[PDB]
C-alpha cells in the first residue's frame, strides 16, 4: 500500500528523512497528498514559499504578474527526492495569459561571483522544462521556432506535436517519462514528443536553443550532462508570476 | 471602434483626463492621429516642445545638431499614459547620420541639488531605449560592445540580432513588447532580441553598462526596478539633436 520515499530539507542536503507515501497496483506513488507540502520545498530553500498554497486538493501558485522576477515570497517548487528513471503524471491548469512549467532532472546549482559569494542559478539552466502556457494569449506562444514554446514542449527545443492543449482555465494532463535516457512528454493522453539525453542529437538541440554553449555556457554545461554525474534530479514546478494549479501528482519508479 | 485612454498633462500629474482613441480589431490603439499632439507632451513638461512638429502624417523632431545638449526648445517627447503590459508598433525614419530612440517604461524623475532645488533627471536613466540610428554613418554604431548601440538595440546593453535596419531615409518598422517582464524588440518584422526585467540577468546587464551601480547609482536604482513600484511607464521618443520621423504609432494593451 505504501513506499518509503526519502527527501532533503534544504539546499544540496542529503535525503536523510523519509515519507510513507501511497503506491497503487501499477507502481505510481502519489507524491502530493492534496493537504500538505510534505517532501516539497522551494528550489534552493528549506521551506515552501508562501505564494504556493494548497486549495481544493491542488498545489496552486499565486502569481503577481512579474514573469521571471519571482518577487515577494516566491521561487520554483521541487519535490525534494532525486528520481532517475521514472514516469510522472499530473493534471495542470493555467490562468489566462499564464505561464508556468514542469521541471525534471533538476539540480540545485550555485555559482561563485567575482568576490567568492554564492549565486543560486535558475532551476531551468539544469532542468529540462515541460512548458505550461496559455497557447492563445501568452506572447511566448509565438516566440521560438515551430511552436517549441507552447504547452508540453521541451521548452525552446522541441514542440509538442500534436498541440492538443485544452484552453486556459481547463485541466490538462501531463506525462513525463525518463527511462535510460529516453524522454517522452505526453499531453492529454497522447505522446507529443520524444528525445534521447546525452546524445549528439541532445547537444544539437541545446546548441540551437537559448541554452547554447555560446549564449549560456553554464546552462549548456549542466543540460548537456543532464542530471549531473548520476543522471538524476528533482521534479518541480515553475513560478513564472502567474496563477497555475497542479493536482493528482504521481510518479512511478521504472527500474 | 474607440476606447477611453487616460493621460497626464504635466510633470508627475495624475491621469485625470481621457481621450477617445481608435482601436482596431486586434486591439491596437492608435495613439498618434496624424494631425494633433493630443495626449503627448515633453518629458517633464506640460506642452510639446516646438522642435517637435507634425509633418505629412508623422511626428517629426527638428534637430539642430547638438547631440545630447537638447538646446533650443527641444527635450524628449512622451505619450502621457503609463502602460504596463503592452505591445507598441510604429514606423521610424532617420536622417543621414542621425540618432534618436524609442523609450518605454519611462518615469518622470527629479532629484534634489545641494540647496534642495529640483533637478529634472534624463528620461533614459529610468527608461530602456530602443536605439534609433543611421548605422552606416553615426559613430555610435562603431562604439559600445558587439554593436549594442546600433538601431533596435537595447542601447548599450543588448545588440539587435539580426541587424536588418533599412538605410537612412527609409522607413523601418519597430516593435516593443513588454509582457510580465518579458521584453522583445522587433525591427522590420523580425524579433531581434529578448530579455527579462527584474531578474539577476537584468541586474547583471545593468552592472556591465553605463548605468551600473558604480557609474550611475540613481540610474541603476531606477532601471534595476524598471517601471517603479507598479512596473509601468511612458512610451516616448528622443531628442538627440537630429531630424527623425515617426508614424503609425499603435499600442495594444496585453492584459486586463
Ligand atoms: O501569504 C500569501 C499567500 O497566501 C494567501 O492565503 C493567499 O491565498 C495567496 O494569494 C498568497 O500568495
Ligand atoms: O516559459 C518560459 C519563458 O517565457 C521564459 O524563460 C523560461 C525559462 O527558459 C521559460 O520557462
Ligand atoms: O544614443 C544614445 C547616445 O548617443 C548617447 O546616450 C544616450 C542615452 O543613453 C543614447 O540614447
Ligand atoms: Ca514556463
Ligand atoms: Ca539614441
From Swiss-Prot, chain A:
GO terms under cellular component: plasma membrane
UniProt key word Repeat: no
Effect of deleting the gene: Deletion mutant lacks the ability to convert glucosinolates to isothiocyanates. Monocolonization of mice with the mutant shows reduced isothiocyanate production in the gastrointestinal tract.
Induction pattern: Induced during growth on trehalose.
Enzyme type, top EC level: hydrolase
Entry keyword set: Carbohydrate metabolism, Cell membrane, Glycosidase, Hydrolase, Lipoprotein, Membrane, Palmitate, Signal
Gene Ontology molecular-function annotations: hydrolase activity, acting on glycosyl bonds
Topology of this chain in the membrane: Lipid-anchor
Catalytic activity: 3-dehydro-alpha,alpha-trehalose + H2O = 3-dehydro-D-glucose + D-glucose
Record carries keyword Zinc: no
Main location: membrane
Catalytic activity, EC: 3.2.1.218
InterPro entries the record matches: 3-keto-disaccharide_hydrolase
Cellular localization per UniProt: Cell membrane
Function: 3-keto-disaccharide hydrolase that preferentially hydrolyzes 3-keto-trehalose (3-dehydro-alpha,alpha-trehalose). Important for disaccharide utilization in the human gut. Also shows hydrolysis activity with the glucosinolates glucoraphanin or glucobrassicin, but with much lower efficiency.
Protein name as it appears in the record: 3-keto-disaccharide hydrolase
Amino acid at each position: 500500500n505504501e513506499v518509503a520515499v526519502s527527501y532533503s530539507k534544504s539546499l544540496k542536503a542529503a535525503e536523510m528523512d523519509s515519507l510513507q507515501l501511497p503506491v497503487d497496483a501499477d507502481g505510481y506513488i502519489t507524491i502530493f497528498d492534496g493537504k500538505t507540502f510534505n517532501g516539497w520545498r522551494g528550489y534552493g530553500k528549506d521551506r515552501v514559499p508562501s505564494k504556493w498554497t494548497i486549495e481544493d486538493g491542488c498545489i496552486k501558485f499565486n502569481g503577481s504578474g512579474g514573469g521571471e522576477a519571482q518577487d515577494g515570497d516566491g521561487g520554483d517548487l521541487i519535490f525534494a527526492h532525486k528520481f532517475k528513471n521514472f514516469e510522472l503524471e499530473m493534471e495542470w491548469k493555467v490562468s489566462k495569459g499564464g505561464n508556468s512549467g514542469i521541471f525534471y532532472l533538476a539540480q540545485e546549482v550555485t555559482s561563485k561571483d567575482k568576490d567568492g559569494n554564492d549565486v543560486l542559478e535558475p532551476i531551468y539552466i539544469s532542468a529540462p522544462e515541460y512548458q505550461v502556457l496559455d497557447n492563445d494569449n501568452h506572447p511566448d506562444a509565438k516566440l521560438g521556432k515551430d511552436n517549441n514554446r507552447q504547452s508540453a514542449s521541451l521548452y525552446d527545443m522541441i514542440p509538442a506535436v500534436p498541440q492538443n492543449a485544452k484552453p486556459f482555465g481547463e485541466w490538462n494532463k501531463a506525462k513525463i517519462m525518463v527511462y535510460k535516457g529516453t524522454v517522452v512528454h505526453g499531453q492529454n493522453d497522447e505522446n507529443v514528443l520524444e528525445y534521447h539525453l546525452w546524445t549528439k542529437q541532445w547537444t544539437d538541440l541545446l546548441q540551437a536553443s537559448k541554452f547554447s554553449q555560446d549564449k549560456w555556457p553554464l546552462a549548456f554545461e549542466l543540460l548537456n550532462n543532464c542530471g549531473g554525474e548520476n543522471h538524476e534530479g528533482f521534479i518541480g514546478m515553475q513560478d513564472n508570476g502567474d496563477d497555475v494549479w497542479f493536482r493528482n501528482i504521481r510518479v512511478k519508479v521504472l527500474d
